[PDB]
Amino acid sequence: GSSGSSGEKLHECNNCGKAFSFKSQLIIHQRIHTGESGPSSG
Ligand SMILES: [Zn+2]
């Protein structure tokens, strides 16, 4: 939640309100909102 959108908004996050100029990128970010699945860490 911080104002600072650069470049064209090709893919925006319909959860927090972020923007990504790469479909894949956006998907990688949305992971924070959803439950991921990987190795144990932290
Ligand atoms: Zn988001």
Curated annotation (Swiss-Prot):
Zinc finger (C2H2-type): 11-33
TM region(s), chain numbering: none
Induction info: Down-regulated during erythroid differentiation by GATA1. Down-regulated by HTLV-1 Tax through the CREB/ATF pathway. Up-regulated by the regulator of nonsense transcript UPF1. Up-regulated by the cyclic AMP-dependent transcription factor ATF4.
Annotated disulfide bonds: none
Signal peptide start and end residues: none
UniProt note on tissues of expression: Overexpressed in ovarian cancer tissues compared to normal ovarian tissues. Isoform 1 and isoform 2 are expressed in squamous epithelium tissues. Isoform 2 is overexpressed in squamous cervical cancer (at protein level). Expressed in blood cells. Isoform 1 is expressed in pancreas, lung, skeletal muscle, heart, placenta, liver, kidney and brain. Isoform 2 expressed in chronic lymphocytic leukemia (CLL) and several tumor cell lines. Isoform 3 is expressed in several tumor cells. Isoform 5 is expressed in fetal liver and several tumor cells.
Compartments it resides in: Cytoplasm
Similarity comment text for this entry: Belongs to the krueppel C2H2-type zinc-finger protein family.
UniProt free text on domains: The KRAB domain functions to reinforce the nuclear localization of isoform 1 in addition to its transcription repression activity.
Function: Involved in the regulation of antiviral interferon signaling. During viral infection, recruits SETD4 to TBK1, leading to TBK1 monomethylation, which is critical for the assembly of TBK1 complex and IRF3 signaling.
Subunit structure: Interacts (via the KRAB domain) with TRIM28 (via the RBCC domain); the interaction increases ZNF268 nuclear localization activity. Isoform 2 interacts with CHUK and IKBKB; the interaction is further increased in a TNF-alpha-dependent manner. Forms a ternary complex with TBK1 and SETD4; the interaction between SETD4 and TBK1 is ZNF268-dependent and leads to TBK1 monomethylation.
Protein name: Zinc finger protein 268
Organism: Homo sapiens (Human)
Part of the whole protein covered: 525 to 553 of 947
